[PDB]
Amino acid sequence: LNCGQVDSKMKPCLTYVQGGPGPSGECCNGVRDLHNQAQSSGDRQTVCNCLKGIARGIHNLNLNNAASIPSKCNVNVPYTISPDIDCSRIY
Numbered sequence: 001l002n003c004g005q006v007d008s009k010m011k012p013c014l015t016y017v018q019g020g021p022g023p024s025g026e027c028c029n030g031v032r033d034l035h036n037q038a039q040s041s042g043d044r045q046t047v048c049n050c051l052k053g054i055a056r057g058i059h060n061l062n063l064n065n066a067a068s069i070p071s072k073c074n075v076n077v078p079y080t081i082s083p084d085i086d087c088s089r090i091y
């Protein structure tokens with residue numbers, strides 16, 4: 001329930017969000033894991049803000065690939081992954 005945990009679960013997605021092929025099975029597993037673990041509104045907000053800051057800290061972020069993760073992995077993330085997510089209005 002901290003950004004350390006969030007960046008760990010998402011590490012398998014790193015090559016994909018830097019413009020490489022994907023998302024891998026392991027990447028989709030990481031995001032699905034996070035979704036299952038983020039069961040409350042508070043958890044969803046914390047994970048949102050972690051992902052926004054992480055998106056911001058990734059060198060040469062491929063915006064299209066980053067945004068595509070939830071739909072490509074069939075995970076119901078309630079916002080679009082980018083360096084500029086509005087984490088205030090989830091649900």
Ligand SMILES: *[C@H](CCCCCCCC(=O)O)C(=O)C/C=C\CCCCC
Pocket residue numbers: 007008010011012013014017051053054055057058066081082
């Ligand atoms: C971990 C990357 C850490 C970047 C610095 C974050 C600092 C945050 C702050 O608020 O200051 C990773 O390697 C995770 C890789 C995948 C993330 C993919 C989803 C987001 C695009």
Ligand code: NA
Pocket residue numbers: 062063064066067080081082083
């Ligand atoms: Na994006």
Ligand code: NA
Pocket residue numbers: 086089
């Ligand atoms: Na919004």
Ligand SMILES: [Zn+2]
Pocket residue numbers: 029030033
């Ligand atoms: Zn897992």
Ligand SMILES: [Zn+2]
Pocket residue numbers: 053
């Ligand atoms: Zn920060």
Ligand SMILES: [Zn+2]
Pocket residue numbers: 035076
């Ligand atoms: Zn769900």
